[PDB]
Amino acid sequence: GSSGSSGVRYFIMKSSNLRNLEISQQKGIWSTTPSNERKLNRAFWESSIVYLVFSVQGSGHFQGFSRMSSEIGREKSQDWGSAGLGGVFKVEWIRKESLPFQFAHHLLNPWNDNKKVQISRDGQELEPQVGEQLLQLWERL
């Protein structure tokens, strides 16, 4: 028969504050730790798309998600909250609505002690099985 070899991945990106995220909404870019960039880069090259679910540590909701549009490096920006950065990349914003955890309260991640999706550190790989059904949620809003 047939089988899907290539596919988009899902990475959870946490944000200290909200403002910092605004830059990604206006400038259309995002800068993450150089310890979780590789994946985003490689994956983007080994995958058709790269879904990155952004979330603010504070707010108990999902700031949303954006599919990587450009690789990390060549792209550079200035405006930012945390100077401690190295490697900026673009990102396509799909949903900007705040989704209540309650919605993704049933969804979990069997990749890390089957811990609730939300329960993911910055730059953490999210299973494509739970990361896909987690986005569609924004469609139920």
Structure-block tokens of residue 95: 């949903």
Please list the residues that pair with 88 across neighbouring strands.
31
What residues contact 137, with CB distance under 8 A and at least 6 apart?
A: 99, 103, 104
How many Å is the Cα radius of gyration of the chain? 15
Tokens, residue 37: 């960039």
80 annotated to a ligand binding site: yes
φ and ψ at residue 22, rounded to 5 degrees: -50, -40
Please check if 96 is assigned to a binding site: no
Q: How far apart are CA 137 and CA 141, in angstroms?
A: 7
97: helix, strand or coil:
coil
Cβ burial, residue 126 (10 Å; 0-12/13-18/19+): buried
Rounded to an integer, what distance in angstroms lies between the CA atom of residue 109 and that of residue 44? 21
d(CA 9, CA 84): 26
Experimentally, how was this structure solved? NMR
Which residue from 114, 112, 116, 120 is spatially nearest to 102, judged by alpha carbons? 116
Residue type, 127: E
Output DSSP code: residue 138: G
CA atoms of 34 and 54, how far apart (whole Å): 17
Class for the domain spanning 8-141: alpha beta
Question: Any idea where the domains of the chain sit in the sequence?
Answer: 8-141
What is the three-state SS of 38-70?
HHHHHHHHHCCCEEEEEEECCCCEECEEEEECC
Tokens of 5: 């070899």
Alpha helix ranges (H) inside 2-139? 19-26, 37-46, 101-104, 130-135
15 annotated as belonging to a binding site for a ligand: yes
